[PDB]
Amino acid sequence: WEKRLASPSEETWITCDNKIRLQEGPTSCSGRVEIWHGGSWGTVCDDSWDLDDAQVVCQQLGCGPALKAFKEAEFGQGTGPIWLNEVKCKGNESSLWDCPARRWGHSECGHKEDAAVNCTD
Amino acid sequence: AINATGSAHFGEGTGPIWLDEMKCNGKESRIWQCHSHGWGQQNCRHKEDAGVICSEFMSLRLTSEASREACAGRLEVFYNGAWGTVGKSSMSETTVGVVCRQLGCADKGKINPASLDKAMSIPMWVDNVQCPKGPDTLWQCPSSP
Ligand SMILES: *[C@@H]1O[C@H](CO)[C@@H](O)[C@H](O)[C@H]1NC(C)=O
Ligand SMILES: [Ca+2]
Ligand SMILES: [Ca+2]
Ligand SMILES: [Ca+2]
Ligand SMILES: [Ca+2]
């Protein structure tokens, strides 16, 4: 241990991997919504999965506006736990964590109902 | 059938789900003859409960310009997924009595001429309705087909 000022180059600035991703889709900007929390990845159920909610997810990743928000696990059967439910995004939220939902609660939703979001490039 | 609703349109049941993933040709009379995954072979929840709206299901309501349902205006019947009015000819006093009691407005009512204008035009469904004394709803009153 030493106490000594230094240039900003010696200082560390880190950037962890993104918490929100889309997987299993045919394209890079489309797929099943996968979120990271509690040390493991997981899905989000399709209950009240509106197009407004899909807009937030596409904005978080950085893809284009969401043309369609799907349900009933179109792309494939999800793997892992189910984190969120009944999520209702107004569209003005920057992150999915800002929207109110079943925040890390036991989800009555099964593993056949994993949501999926298709954004444009 | 006219509709085949889902996601607990009419409510959530409480008993154990029996059948699941039903595909059927439509020829067999009983529901049990259709192909099923088994008994209790379910992976759903009570949020997913089936529901239907058959052809013979009917309803009555008095439309008006102010509100879609009210206690005054023109009465309409809803047959096989379509709306329509009721013939005025041969309408006894007791016939208007059953209509008002069924809708929960008053024990008795009266027939008045048409208002200044009609909101919309619909095909007339039934005519020559004669309600006897004793029935509570219009569906038990004989009339023309
Ligand atoms: C039933 O189906 C008809 C015809 O498509 C539709 O107009 C109506 O909204 C449906 N009703 C319900 C309750 O789903
Ligand atoms: Ca659903
Ligand atoms: Ca929503
Ligand atoms: Ca079927
Ligand atoms: Ca099932």
- For every residue of B60-128, DSSP letters joined together read EEEE-SS-SSBSSSEEEEEETTEEEEB--SS--HHHHHHHHHHHTS-S--------S--S------B--
CA A4 to chain centre: 41
Please report the resolution in angstroms.
3.3
Residue A19 and residue A37 in contact, taking contact as beta carbons nearer than 8 Å: yes
Q: Which ligand is nearest to the CA of A46?
A: 2
- Other C-beta atoms closer than 10 Å to the C-beta of A10 total 8
Rounded distance, CA A88 to CA B83, Å?
35
Rounded distance, CA B87 to CA B127, Å?
4
Rounded distance, CA B81 to CA B10, Å?
17
SS3 A40: strand
Distance in angstroms between the alpha carbons of the first and the last residue of chain A? 48
Contact A109/B at CB under 8 A:
yes
Here the tokens at position A105 are: 């609660």
SS3 B32: helix
Q: Do B45 and A108 touch (CB under 8 A)?
A: yes
Distance B31 CA to ligand 4 centre (A): 11
**Atom of ligand 1 at shortest distance to CA of B9?**
13
Give every CB contact of residue B28 below 8 A, 6+ residues apart in sequence: B34
CA angle B37, A73, A50 (to 5 degrees): 130
Rounded distance, CA A102 to CA A47, Å?
11
Distance in angstroms between the alpha carbons of the first and the last residue of chain B? 20
- Other C-beta atoms closer than 10 Å to the C-beta of B55 total 10
DSSP state letter for A17: P
Amino acid identity, residue A76? G
Residue A66 and residue A57 in contact, taking contact as beta carbons nearer than 8 Å: yes
Closest CA to A71 of A33, A101, A24, A17: A33
SS3 A36: strand
Contact A108/B at CB under 8 A:
yes
Rounded distance, CA A88 to CA A46, Å?
11
- Other C-beta atoms closer than 10 Å to the C-beta of A30 total 22
Beta-sheet pairing, A30-37 with A20-23: antiparallel
A94-119: b (≥16 Cβ within 10 Å) or e: eebeebebbeeeebebbbebbbbbbb
Amino acid identity, residue B32? W
**Atom of ligand 1 at shortest distance to CA of B5?**
14
Instruction: Report residue A51: phi and psi, to 5°.
Output: -70, -25
Beta-sheet pairing, A82-84 with A40-44: parallel
A51 — alpha (psi -120 to 50), left (phi > 0) or beta?
Answer: alpha
Q: Which ligand is nearest to the CA of B40?
A: 5
Here the tokens at position B57 are: 């299901």
- Other C-beta atoms closer than 10 Å to the C-beta of A76 total 13
Q: Do B43 and A110 touch (CB under 8 A)?
A: yes
- The experimental method behind these coordinates is cryo-EM
Contact A72/B at CB under 8 A:
no
Rounded distance, CA A86 to CA A19, Å?
19
Closest CA to A116 of A63, A49, A18: A49
Which residue from B3, B54, B57, B80 has its CB within 8 A of the most atoms of ligand 1, so it is best to mutate?
A: B3
